[PDB]
């Protein structure tokens, strides 16, 4: 057919290649990857800015998403932060998932804890918290070469 | 796809025999597992604290290694700064290696970049990098459960 029809057909392949990608990923469970991708169907930024991506992939760790409206913010984190601090949202988590929020906003250069999320996460994070982390960063840093 | 995650994880189940296979570990050559192993016996009075093991992999990489004045370094980073900040060896360095320091000396508390070396790091390493992040990061939580 035509070149717009071709370069659909195209997006359509890409998508399932990445659908198929994604599929490989740790997850803490079958939630997990369901949320994942309902997120990255909502967050459609996600598509092109691998930082959206790698949100929506925390976004949907079942204490998070199951505890918090993630549907309602037009912002991935905007939940979790304003003029006062942290919210009673982002209080009611887990300590080493509120460690892992933090170190993804670190990423944006949005540091909301002293001690970082970062030095936090690396001094208590158990191995299942690092298997996130771990697959976190290398959705944020897909491009790598 | 996820294999060296899954070794990564392997790596912190049976920490309690890690001596027995860091020949195992991602190094980026040989000469980097080389610089770590001596490094790791030059160290031997304080490695059973895995930040100072994550500290001898980083220094054991060879443009860092060769900079390195290790004979005049208490710990594995005490060349990195002084009372007068970060030393010439430190600016010395390809920045994505000064990032990797940087983001170690985080793990401790010891901020020296802004951004971050984590958040620089984490917009900017390559897969080698990355890797290299990635090892360092499964040392240092080798007492994850």
Redesign the interface.
């Known amino acids: 057919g035509s070149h717009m029809f071709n370069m659909l057909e195209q997006q359509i392949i890409h998508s399932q290649d990445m659908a198929h990608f994604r599929s490989?990923?740790?997850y803490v469970n079958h939630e997990h990857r369901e949320n994942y991708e309902a997120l990255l169907i909502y967050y459609k930024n996600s598509i092109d800015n691998p930082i959206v991506d790698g949100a929506c992939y925390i976004l949907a760790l079942p204490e998070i998403f199951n505890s918090v409206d993630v549907f309602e913010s037009e912002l991935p984190f905007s939940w979790v932060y304003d003029e006062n601090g942290i919210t009673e949202t982002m209080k009611s988590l887990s300590i080493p998932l509120q460690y892992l929020v933090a170190?993804a906003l670190?990423?944006?250069?949005v540091?909301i804890f002293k001690?970082?999320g970062?030095?936090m996460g690396?001094?208590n994070?158990?191995?299942a918290?690092?298997?996130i982390?771990?697959?976190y960063?290398?959705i944020?840093?897909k491009e790598?070469?």
């Not at 670190?106 to 250069?109: M, R």
Request: hydrophobic share 50%; aromatic share 20%; no cysteine.
């Open positions: 490989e990923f740790f170190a670190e990423v944006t250069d540091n001690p970082s970062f030095t690396m001094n994070w158990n191995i918290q690092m298997r982390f771990w697959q960063t290398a944020i840093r790598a070469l």
